[PDB]
Amino acid sequence: APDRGPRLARLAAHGHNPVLIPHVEVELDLVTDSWADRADPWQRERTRALADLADEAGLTGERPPELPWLPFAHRFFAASGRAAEERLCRAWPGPRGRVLHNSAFPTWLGTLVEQGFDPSVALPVAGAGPYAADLDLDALDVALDRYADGVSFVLVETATNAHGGAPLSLDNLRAVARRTRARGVPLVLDATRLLDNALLVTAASGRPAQDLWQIAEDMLGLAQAVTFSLSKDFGVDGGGLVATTDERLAERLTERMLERGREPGLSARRVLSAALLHQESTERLVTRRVADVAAFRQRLELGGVPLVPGPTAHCVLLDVDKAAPGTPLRHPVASYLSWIYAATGVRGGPHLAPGVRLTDGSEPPERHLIRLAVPLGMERKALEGAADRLAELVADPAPVADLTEVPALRVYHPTDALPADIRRAL
Amino acid sequence: RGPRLARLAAHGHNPVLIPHVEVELDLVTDSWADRADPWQRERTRALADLADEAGLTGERPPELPWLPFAHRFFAASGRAAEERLCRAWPGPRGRVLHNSAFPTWLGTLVEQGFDPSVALPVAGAGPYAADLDLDALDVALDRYADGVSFVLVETATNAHGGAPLSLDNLRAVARRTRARGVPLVLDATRLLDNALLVTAASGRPAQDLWQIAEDMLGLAQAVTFSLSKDFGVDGGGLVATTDERLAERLTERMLERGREPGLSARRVLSAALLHQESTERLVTRRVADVAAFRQRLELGGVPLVPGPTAHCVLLDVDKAAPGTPLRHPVASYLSWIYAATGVRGGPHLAPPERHLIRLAVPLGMERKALEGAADRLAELVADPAPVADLTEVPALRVYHPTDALPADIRR
Numbered sequence A: 001a002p003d004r005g006p007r008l009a010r011l012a013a014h015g016h017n018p019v020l021i022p023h024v025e026v027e028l029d030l031v032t033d034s035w036a037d038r039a040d041p042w043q044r045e046r047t048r049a050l051a052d053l054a055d056e057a058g059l060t061g062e063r064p065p066e067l068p069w070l071p072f073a074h075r076f077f078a079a080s081g082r083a084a085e086e087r088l089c090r091a092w093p094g095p096r097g098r099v100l101h102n103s104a105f106p107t108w109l110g111t112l113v114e115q116g117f118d119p120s121v122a123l124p125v126a127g128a129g130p131y132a133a134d135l136d137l138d139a140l141d142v143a144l145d146r147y148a149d150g151v152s153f154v155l156v157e158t159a160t161n162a163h164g165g166a167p168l169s170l171d172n173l174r175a176v177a178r179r180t181r182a183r184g185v186p187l188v189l190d191a192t193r194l195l196d197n198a199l200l201v202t203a204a205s206g207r208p209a210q211d212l213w214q215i216a217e218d219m220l221g222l223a224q225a226v227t228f229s230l231s232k233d234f235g236v237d238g239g240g241l242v243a244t245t246d247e248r249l250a251e252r253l254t255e256r257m258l259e260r261g262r263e264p265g266l267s268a269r270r271v272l273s274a275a276l277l278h279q280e281s282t283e284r285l286v287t288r289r290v291a292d293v294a295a296f297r298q299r300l301e302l303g304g305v306p307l308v309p310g311p312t313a314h315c316v317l318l319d320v321d322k323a324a325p326g327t328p329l330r331h332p333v334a335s336y337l338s339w340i341y342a343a344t345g346v347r348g349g350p351h352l353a354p355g356v357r358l359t360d361g362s363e364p365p366e367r368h369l370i371r372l373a374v375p376l377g378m379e380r381k382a383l384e385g386a387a388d389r390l391a392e393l394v395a396d397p398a399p400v401a402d403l404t405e406v407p408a409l410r411v412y413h414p415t416d417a418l419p420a421d422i423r424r425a426l
Numbered sequence B: 001r002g003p004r005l006a007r008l009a010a011h012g013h014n015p016v017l018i019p020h021v022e023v024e025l026d027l028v029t030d031s032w033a034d035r036a037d038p039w040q041r042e043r044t045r046a047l048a049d050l051a052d053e054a055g056l057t058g059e060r061p062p063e064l065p066w067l068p069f070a071h072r073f074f075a076a077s078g079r080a081a082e083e084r085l086c087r088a089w090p091g092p093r094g095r096v097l098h099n100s101a102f103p104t105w106l107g108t109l110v111e112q113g114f115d116p117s118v119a120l121p122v123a124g125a126g127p128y129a130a131d132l133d134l135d136a137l138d139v140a141l142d143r144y145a146d147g148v149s150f151v152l153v154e155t156a157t158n159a160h161g162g163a164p165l166s167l168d169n170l171r172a173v174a175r176r177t178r179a180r181g182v183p184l185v186l187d188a189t190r191l192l193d194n195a196l197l198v199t200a201a202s203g204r205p206a207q208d209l210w211q212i213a214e215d216m217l218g219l220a221q222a223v224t225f226s227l228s229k230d231f232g233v234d235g236g237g238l239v240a241t242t243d244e245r246l247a248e249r250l251t252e253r254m255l256e257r258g259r260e261p262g263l264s265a266r267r268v269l270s271a272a273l274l275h276q277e278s279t280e281r282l283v284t285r286r287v288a289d290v291a292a293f294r295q296r297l298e299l300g301g302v303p304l305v306p307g308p309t310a311h312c313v314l315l316d317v318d319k320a321a322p323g324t325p326l327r328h329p330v331a332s333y334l335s336w337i338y339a340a341t342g343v344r345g346g347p348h349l350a351p352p353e354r355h356l357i358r359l360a361v362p363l364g365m366e367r368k369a370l371e372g373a374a375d376r377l378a379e380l381v382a383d384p385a386p387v388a389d390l391t392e393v394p395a396l397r398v399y400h401p402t403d404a405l406p407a408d409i410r411r
């Protein structure tokens, strides 16, 4: 990869943490699939296409359209997924107790605490196999019943990011919903990547990709409320959605919208409306992304890059402990992220622990994992080139530079070239 | 600028930590023992040729017309020479009064049982700003009567920015030490530069520096040199004395522990001390190049401590970066200078607190390199952009740019 020198200067300007480099300066950004954090060239053409569709259908943008695949009478736009989470949590009518979740996205956890809920109980998952994100149904039973009458809702994120985008099966989600329904506990989905999960289920069942909508509607129908970040599956530059069957929750969501107004802006809402309605292009984009994740995975695995096994929706997890086996690094993920970026121009991000305790309250052993995420619209050829460079890097015998942290957005410095007294101090 | 920023970040945002060979223009020191500039190899070859032609043995420093000492000893470095002198000292060990001598002396004196806690003040202004305050010297000699092992004077004193002491002042100092029977020791590492500055101030030709140097050296009972500042050699030191008892102890220790540095180096040192013509040429050029560097910096509006000086200029950070506040002004400005210009200076903290950067010029450097450096420094001073603030990460500190630190990490 050319231009190592400029990348080393970029690392130096950003505390040797490639996550802090501006997206537009990164050669191949795989830190996130969120279009809200990206400005790739294909995003402009997509906005133009959706704005044209909005004009042709006379979409107003006033409120979310009725959608054949979304079985909810009460639908609300938000500025982002995390704003949609805030709207739901603020509007929640019932008493505020625990929220049991399958290691939900970190934006949820702060919002839940701020709004008076207790998200300290994370639900464990299968952790291996074809549906590695399946909830452990016995542990779900234990938590629901431990905390009988003290659980506000169960929150399930499909294609769970904390579990590397592994899918949960429709059978598993129906089993979760039988348990919540039996107890009168609401089920809430974080459906940001539910279409990718629905596609993975169709594919594991030997079914055409176009069946994803049937499975998706089945999954959505199990929930009493859902939230979406729209910028992961729907090819839009930002935006969120809340939907519910619960009349009381809907009343409170509506009254808050009256106090504060609708978000995002009208032109953006017309584009979100077009995206939600135009199933053919959401289907196209999602199917290609999942397929290109699998192609990227295969190119990596056949090049000897060790990965957490799939299948997965939107990303692969590179296992640094296996990729750099004899290299004792003080901060393995941080050092390897900087090393990958310097050598290849590919930017990944750190993958945090799911935060699920063992039987005895202990923490599971530490994992050193890098997430490489694939946005809708990315070219397979770019990913195959990236996999080839990553495989060359893993095959290279040079030692990885051992970064020291200044006591995902931490700052580091190399210790190699400093005096012995200073380096020992640091 | 890109590659320099990467280099700065790999060395704790402290240009003093970068290896000398990786610095574009190194002005951190004039010492050849800390440098490997291209001209050094050719100089060594020329001196080795001279040693061969003259059949020098390297066994002892040669007799020199300007060095009035019968007892002369090589050492591995200036600081080793200081150690040899202090270890051999036969007299009772008490206070050493010094004119803010080089830091290697202070540690060596303490380790050898001497007390260097009393520094002698200097004039600070006037024709010779580094001249010793003679009334203060008298007070100190009377206050510490019978408890002073020696008075230590460093010419062209680095702590005072390389300003010269006059021959008249050194004679007045030595008359006072003689009157009390207290030996005078000189750190003569840059005595030749001091002698040249005195010839200039007296309207005398530069070739008279050897006569002034001999006049100065002849006042002292013992002298030490780091040879790598004035003699165009890659390392080495010299101790000399008139004192028979000190000489016997230096000799005894040399017989127990052996001569230093190695023989080949000692022959090159001997050739350098003997070949006055090239030392005169290099020292005269260096002092003149400092003066030219100074003038060009002045022409560009770069604020400097006034001269004339031997081996360096002191850049005044308080005047060069007036305006918004820096937690570590010298460190931030050193980083700023290096990033923008490729010039590496060093901190000068020698004696309300002054923020000064030392830009030192080794023998052999080209004037065109200095004039280019001054022009780049002039442009940097003319730049209105605020200097990036640095935060220290807990001498020779490591830093991180303050704006890059999250609020948690800062606290």
Ligand SMILES: [K+]
Pocket: A031, A032, A033, A034, A037
């Ligand atoms: K993101």
Ligand SMILES: [K+]
Pocket: A047, A236, A237, A271
């Ligand atoms: K847009």
Ligand SMILES: [K+]
Pocket: A036, A080, A081, A082, A238, A239
């Ligand atoms: K967002």
Ligand SMILES: [K+]
Pocket: B021, B022, B023, B024, B025
């Ligand atoms: K250089």
Ligand SMILES: [K+]
Pocket: B039, B040, B041, B043, B044, B232, B233, B234
């Ligand atoms: K040399």
Ligand SMILES: [K+]
Pocket: B064, B065, B273, B274, B275, B276
């Ligand atoms: K001679």
